[PDB]
Amino acid sequence: GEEQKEIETLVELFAEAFREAKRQKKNGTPEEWARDAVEEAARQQGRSRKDVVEALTKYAQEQGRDELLKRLGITPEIYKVIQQIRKEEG
Amino acid sequence: EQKEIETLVELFAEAFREAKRQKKNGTPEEWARDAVEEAARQQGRSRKDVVEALTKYAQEQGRDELLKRLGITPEIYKVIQQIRKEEG
User: Which residues of chain B does A71 touch, with a Cβ-Cβ cutoff of 8 Å?
Assistant: First the structure.
């Protein structure tokens, strides 16, 4: 519905800004990038920062946590270690 | 095939929780490596079979399902929820 569309737009703007913040500030932290991205997506759509994390939370619950993570380009550390062991063994 | 992978994931998951209890100040990498060797020892199998079964389970069932069993929340989602707490 229209609510799904509003969520998708905020999620996409946040994921675009997060990937861009990671690119521009490579030595930053995931928290730094997420905070920049929330600020950025909020000013684009003309929404609050609360509205941004609201949508990200709704997206995670309705689509899955891994779905949001795929759009951010994030592999959880535990899988990074599983792939490293996989490479070590193989 | 399905039963073989779900049982390996079970062993790895409880070995991970166990390692996290025995090494509470350890890192996630130390726990995962302990659990891979643990599950391999329990079933008399190789380390490569364990992480392959993990990767296959994660691909068919999703990434966050294995993490739910580990009791691990990705760092980025702890960040999001921290911001949501602040905006509240």
Answer: none
Gap between the Cα atoms of B2 and A83, Å rounded: 21
Overall residue count recorded for chain B in this entry: 88
B71: left (phi over 0), alpha (psi -120 to 50) or beta: left
Nearest Cα residue to A8 out of A59, A82, A49: A59
Indicate which technique resolved this structure: X-ray
CA B34 remoteness from chain centre: 11
Element (H, E) at B77: helix B75-87
Q: Where are the alpha helices (DSSP H) in A25-48?
A: 30-45
Backbone φ and ψ for B43, nearest 5 degrees, come out as -100, 5
One-letter amino acid at B24 equals K
To which residue do tokens 């270690």 refer? A81
Centre a 10 Å sphere on the Cβ of residue B39 and count the other Cβ atoms it contains: 26
For A13, A26, A78, B55, B69, the CA distances from B27, given in Å and listed in that order, are 33, 23, 10, 21, 17
What is the Cα–Cα distance from A70 to A80, expressed in whole angstroms? 14
In A, minimum Cα distance to B76 occurs at: A30
Residue A20 CB partners (closer than 8 Å, separation 6+): A37, A40
Tell whether B60 lies on the interface with A, counting CB pairs under 8 A.
Answer: no
